Amino acid sequence: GSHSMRYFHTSVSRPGRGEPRFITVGYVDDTLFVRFDSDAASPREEPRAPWIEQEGPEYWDRETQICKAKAQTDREDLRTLLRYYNQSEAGSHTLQNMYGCDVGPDGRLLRGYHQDAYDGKDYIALNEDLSSWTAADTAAQITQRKWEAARVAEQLRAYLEGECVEWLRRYLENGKETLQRADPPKTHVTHHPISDHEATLRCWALGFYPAEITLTWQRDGEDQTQDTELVETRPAGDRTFQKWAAVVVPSGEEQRYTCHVQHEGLPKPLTLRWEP
């Protein structure tokens, strides 16, 4: 299958309440594996998956120094961005960075990413070519000129095509028991009377990994997208995810309705119905 690695970073300034808080996390696919929080006492990057724990002290030292450096760059960048947007020093602002790579079933690079946002909006992004930039506004154009002059994109390309892919391949092997296992949804349909005239049928998908899933209702083989309540996929807290889809049905018509479930972990897509 195809896989991804991402590092997410957020600094939030808090004028009059010390230096910004900095939090970064790393994921492979939908699995958190490392974390760093600047407000921890003597902060270190820490493992959050079993398969990364085997990395040696030199790995944790380098990671932690990278994280502390990123917090420091962010502090300077938050100051700079106040100037670029003609903002007062009184308010809290946010700086976000994501980077990483996608690989295919063969382990080859599919796409690399590096993008920044200020106050929840795009600032500057590396394009898919890993060679040119998209600046969101005239402020980010100042950054773009600075980063073009310094050949930043060339550095990112080298990381994203090389280490990002190589280390992701390493993690997928070391974590093969979990990262390369899809857990199918456990599914069932429940029935929730509204009145003597209608009831809700709710189709449940529980315990699945990764998070990607499709849940639909049909009535006599026709989709019911407009009349379906579909909740956002949500974490269970044990690596897995949950989702449900619900439709309101006239009393006595329940056997017309089928729920359809597609997920990577299932031997075959499911068709389920309410079973009194």
Binding site: Y7, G26, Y59, R62, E63, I66, C67, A69, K70, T73, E76, D77, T80, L81, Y84, N97, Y99, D116, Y123, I124, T143, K146, W147, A150, V152, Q155, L156, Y159, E163, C164, W167
Partner: peptide
């Protein structure tokens, strides 16, 4: 593993 960010905005 991560990369170092080197350049400020």
């Amino acid at each position: 593993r991560r990369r170092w960010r080197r350049l400020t905005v």
